[PDB]
Amino acid sequence: QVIRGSGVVKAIDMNSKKITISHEAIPAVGWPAMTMRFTFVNADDAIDAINALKTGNHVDFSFIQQGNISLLKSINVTQ
Ligand SMILES: [Zn+2]
């Protein structure tokens, strides 16, 4: 139920708490490569996403599915 992904951060919205990630195929849930919105709960996850947005560096992340909400459980940026 914890799903892992990778991609590039393309957008962040602090009102909706949404990180837009252009992610790779995720075979565990049968999703193709897409640009999709993930919800963050913690300022740390947002600050990692914001540094990824600046650099364009690849990001690894995990989330769970609640319908239209993909809830971020972790995020790592890679220099
Ligand atoms: Zn912290």
TrEMBL record:
<feature type="binding site">
    <location>
        <position position="44"/>
    </location>
    <ligand>
        <name>Zn(2+)</name>
    </ligand>
</feature>
<feature type="binding site">
    <location>
        <position position="58"/>
    </location>
    <ligand>
        <name>Cu(2+) 2</name>
    </ligand>
</feature>
<keyword id="KW-0614">Plasmid</keyword>
<keyword id="KW-0479">Metal-binding</keyword>
<feature type="binding site">
    <location>
        <position position="36"/>
    </location>
    <ligand>
        <name>Cu(2+) 1</name>
    </ligand>
</feature>
<feature type="binding site">
    <location>
        <position position="24"/>
    </location>
    <ligand>
        <name>Cu(2+) 2</name>
    </ligand>
</feature>
<protein>
    <submittedName>
        <fullName>SilF</fullName>
    </submittedName>
</protein>
<dbReference type="GO" id="GO:0046872">
    <property type="term" value="F:metal ion binding"/>
</dbReference>
<feature type="binding site">
    <location>
        <position position="34"/>
    </location>
    <ligand>
        <name>Cu(2+) 1</name>
    </ligand>
</feature>
<keyword id="KW-0862">Zinc</keyword>
<feature type="binding site">
    <location>
        <position position="23"/>
    </location>
    <ligand>
        <name>Cu(2+) 1</name>
    </ligand>
</feature>
